[PDB]
Design goal:
This is part of a larger assembly, with four copies of chain A. Helices cover 72% and strands 0% of the residues of chain A. Chain A is mainly α. In chain A, helix 1 (10-37) runs antiparallel to helix 2 (45-72), helix 1 packs antiparallel against helix 3 and helix 3 (92-119) runs antiparallel to helix 4. The complex binds chloride ion (CL) (37 copies), fe (iii) ion (17 copies) and magnesium ion (26 copies). One chloride ion binds at residues 146-147, 150, 170 of chain B.
Chain lengths: 173, 173, 173, 173
Amino acid sequence: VSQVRQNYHSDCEAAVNRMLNLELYASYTYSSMYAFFDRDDVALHNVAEFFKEQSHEEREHAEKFMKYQNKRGGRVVLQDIKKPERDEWGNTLEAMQAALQLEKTVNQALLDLHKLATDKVDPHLCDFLESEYLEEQVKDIKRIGDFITNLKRLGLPENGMGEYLFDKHSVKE
Amino acid sequence: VSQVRQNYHSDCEAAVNRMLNLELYASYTYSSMYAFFDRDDVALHNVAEFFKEQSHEEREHAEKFMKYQNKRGGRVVLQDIKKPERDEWGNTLEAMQAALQLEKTVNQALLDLHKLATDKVDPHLCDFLESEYLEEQVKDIKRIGDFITNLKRLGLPENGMGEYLFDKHSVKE
Amino acid sequence: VSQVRQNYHSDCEAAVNRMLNLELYASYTYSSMYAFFDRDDVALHNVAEFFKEQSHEEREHAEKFMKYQNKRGGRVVLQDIKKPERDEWGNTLEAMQAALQLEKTVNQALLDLHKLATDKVDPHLCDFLESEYLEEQVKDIKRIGDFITNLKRLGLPENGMGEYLFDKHSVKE
Amino acid sequence: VSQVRQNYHSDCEAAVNRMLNLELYASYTYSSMYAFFDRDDVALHNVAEFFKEQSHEEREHAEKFMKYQNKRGGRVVLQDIKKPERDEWGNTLEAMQAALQLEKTVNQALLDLHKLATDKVDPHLCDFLESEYLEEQVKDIKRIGDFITNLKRLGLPENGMGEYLFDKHSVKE
Ligand SMILES: [Cl-]
Ligand SMILES: [Cl-]
Ligand SMILES: [Cl-]
Ligand SMILES: [Cl-]
Ligand SMILES: [Cl-]
Ligand SMILES: [Cl-]
Ligand SMILES: [Cl-]
Ligand SMILES: [Cl-]
Ligand SMILES: [Cl-]
Ligand SMILES: [Cl-]
Ligand SMILES: [Cl-]
Ligand SMILES: [Cl-]
Ligand SMILES: [Cl-]
Ligand SMILES: [Cl-]
Ligand SMILES: [Cl-]
Ligand SMILES: [Cl-]
Ligand SMILES: [Cl-]
Ligand SMILES: [Cl-]
Ligand SMILES: [Cl-]
Ligand SMILES: [Cl-]
Ligand SMILES: [Cl-]
Ligand SMILES: [Cl-]
Ligand SMILES: [Cl-]
Ligand SMILES: [Cl-]
Ligand SMILES: [Cl-]
Ligand SMILES: [Cl-]
Ligand SMILES: [Cl-]
Ligand SMILES: [Cl-]
Ligand SMILES: [Cl-]
Ligand SMILES: [Cl-]
Ligand SMILES: [Cl-]
Ligand SMILES: [Cl-]
Ligand SMILES: [Cl-]
Ligand SMILES: [Cl-]
Ligand SMILES: [Cl-]
Ligand SMILES: [Cl-]
Ligand SMILES: [Cl-]
Ligand SMILES: [Fe+3]
Ligand SMILES: [Fe+3]
Ligand SMILES: [Fe+3]
Ligand SMILES: [Fe+3]
Ligand SMILES: [Fe+3]
Ligand SMILES: [Fe+3]
Ligand SMILES: [Fe+3]
Ligand SMILES: [Fe+3]
Ligand SMILES: [Fe+3]
Ligand SMILES: [Fe+3]
Ligand SMILES: [Fe+3]
Ligand SMILES: [Fe+3]
Ligand SMILES: [Fe+3]
Ligand SMILES: [Fe+3]
Ligand SMILES: [Fe+3]
Ligand SMILES: [Fe+3]
Ligand SMILES: [Fe+3]
Ligand SMILES: [Mg+2]
Ligand SMILES: [Mg+2]
Ligand SMILES: [Mg+2]
Ligand SMILES: [Mg+2]
Ligand SMILES: [Mg+2]
Ligand SMILES: [Mg+2]
Ligand SMILES: [Mg+2]
Ligand SMILES: [Mg+2]
Ligand SMILES: [Mg+2]
Ligand SMILES: [Mg+2]
Ligand SMILES: [Mg+2]
Ligand SMILES: [Mg+2]
Ligand SMILES: [Mg+2]
Ligand SMILES: [Mg+2]
Ligand SMILES: [Mg+2]
Ligand SMILES: [Mg+2]
Ligand SMILES: [Mg+2]
Ligand SMILES: [Mg+2]
Ligand SMILES: [Mg+2]
Ligand SMILES: [Mg+2]
Ligand SMILES: [Mg+2]
Ligand SMILES: [Mg+2]
Ligand SMILES: [Mg+2]
Ligand SMILES: [Mg+2]
Ligand SMILES: [Mg+2]
Ligand SMILES: [Mg+2]
């Protein structure tokens, strides 16, 4: 019954809250990858910093959904942020493969939310997803795929020299 | 039969003209609010200037529809701009409540136009509304709602000190 | 068995992981307060932004513990970040009271960790807490206490004008 | 019987002199590593310069203890600076392993000195060690550990290409 609410279905409000949680979950998974690559027995600092940046970007995605919810007159409802699926991430290839799957999971949830918004005839929510989320996902999925191709080319997981070279030439210094 | 016309339904052309009129109507209502708050026996100049700015923005919305109509090969058809519903606006709370309802009326018309454009399979018109109109409405509706909440907190309509404080701290100097 | 590990007790490593979780929990609680004050029916934007900033600072506290853990040769172990205790925060006074208690809870955990580090004769961990955490807590606790005193002076919770004045004069614009 | 002396135990004064000697010993060992990597039949100049810098930093650590001794009213007593344990350092991996052990030996001596200062209730000496020495050690130990992990990844000692790559991408140009 918010005074600002107009053309905003309860189902979409709830799905936005669930999407918010998933963004926070993604942030936390990336934070775990950062910490792993920062370990003294892993020590791939450019890879670590790549994942730290990914983590911060996911938190920005989450905060943008909070703001959106309030703009439409919905109510933010938070749930636990589940810990990541793994405590250690193997190596750069395994981590990038997990990152690819994570970004595709997030993308599928965004696409599902777009379908719901379409079904409920909510063009503002459609526009928001298209303008602020969907292209970011396609771009990041492509970037991570490109990385995986190069890690395989470099002989991961077996080729430690390849892994070193990737950290020194493929990710930001 | 315009040489530029392509995928532009007569119904959408007509609805764009009606939307243009509504934007002009909204501009005129805001102009009335400006004049009211500029009265010597009302004298809330920051509130007055807020509504003057709202009025100018609505005229910009109208002109953008005129340009759009011509870009698609439709023909601008003007009708009378009806005078506002009231000659005096009571106080800042009453005016903001009327502004909220006005912005929601405009928003509903834009949403209805988007539905029509969708029905007629006009993605250019959909994009135009989503990119140039729908988010502006959500933003302004939220801003005015926020103002109303604060005016109520400040004890409007009875609390004149509250009304003074709002004009001096909530709206641009 | 990390090659860098020296004078770092398993108990301290575990307690650092638990402290990390608590920092993340604090961040999430502050994020909830931000979202609440950003609601159209609450609409205290300077208060909202204060809590958003608090939330970001807690995430910085968490990341610093992750880095610390790795520097000492411990291993970051993550757990679920529990959702905040409340879904809505009442008003500025109730939220500030909850913030005070949260900062004191965090402070007690830091003091307990310092006691453990002292018991295990770990001066590096003692220094880290004293140089990076303990004074921040005292400062923030004092700031929030000062705010609460002023909110009470301004007649919270009943005095809406007082609450408005606080948002406009006590917290950053 | 120095006029400035206050709360400075004879045991701490003596231990500071022994610590000074150890800093000088560490400097000399690093100087030997510099000279080794500068050999025409070793020729890893970035590695050589890394160790030269390490050597200079250890001399700075020593001089700071001399100044400290005098500030407290103790008397600097010098002993021979023993030559390093080896005349040649094998390769980058062997040298980094020796550097890690050296930094941990220095760290243990600093921790032992902190324990003594604690036992003698000398908070100024505790603060000095915590503020000027202990974090430097943790940082350098982590850095060298990280290097060792990367040298192993690069196939040291057998992989000469790996050793070349490390010198060109892991240590300052
Ligand atoms: Cl609705
Ligand atoms: Cl929900
Ligand atoms: Cl996984
Ligand atoms: Cl695992
Ligand atoms: Cl996933
Ligand atoms: Cl959905
Ligand atoms: Cl995007
Ligand atoms: Cl691109
Ligand atoms: Cl690439
Ligand atoms: Cl046509
Ligand atoms: Cl018409
Ligand atoms: Cl009216
Ligand atoms: Cl009237
Ligand atoms: Cl209306
Ligand atoms: Cl229509
Ligand atoms: Cl817009
Ligand atoms: Cl906005
Ligand atoms: Cl406001
Ligand atoms: Cl240990
Ligand atoms: Cl743990
Ligand atoms: Cl609570
Ligand atoms: Cl609640
Ligand atoms: Cl608490
Ligand atoms: Cl503890
Ligand atoms: Cl601090
Ligand atoms: Cl202070
Ligand atoms: Cl204050
Ligand atoms: Cl005032
Ligand atoms: Cl003395
Ligand atoms: Cl001596
Ligand atoms: Cl040796
Ligand atoms: Cl030798
Ligand atoms: Cl040694
Ligand atoms: Cl000692
Ligand atoms: Cl230090
Ligand atoms: Cl560091
Ligand atoms: Cl490294
Ligand atoms: Fe980025
Ligand atoms: Fe995301
Ligand atoms: Fe992402
Ligand atoms: Fe990205
Ligand atoms: Fe404006
Ligand atoms: Fe308009
Ligand atoms: Fe408008
Ligand atoms: Fe506007
Ligand atoms: Fe701050
Ligand atoms: Fe904290
Ligand atoms: Fe805090
Ligand atoms: Fe703070
Ligand atoms: Fe004032
Ligand atoms: Fe240096
Ligand atoms: Fe040293
Ligand atoms: Fe050193
Ligand atoms: Fe150093
Ligand atoms: Mg209401
Ligand atoms: Mg609902
Ligand atoms: Mg979920
Ligand atoms: Mg679980
Ligand atoms: Mg569309
Ligand atoms: Mg679009
Ligand atoms: Mg785009
Ligand atoms: Mg690319
Ligand atoms: Mg013609
Ligand atoms: Mg027609
Ligand atoms: Mg009309
Ligand atoms: Mg009439
Ligand atoms: Mg837009
Ligand atoms: Mg605002
Ligand atoms: Mg090992
Ligand atoms: Mg343990
Ligand atoms: Mg806990
Ligand atoms: Mg629970
Ligand atoms: Mg301090
Ligand atoms: Mg103060
Ligand atoms: Mg004398
Ligand atoms: Mg003596
Ligand atoms: Mg000695
Ligand atoms: Mg000898
Ligand atoms: Mg320090
Ligand atoms: Mg490093």
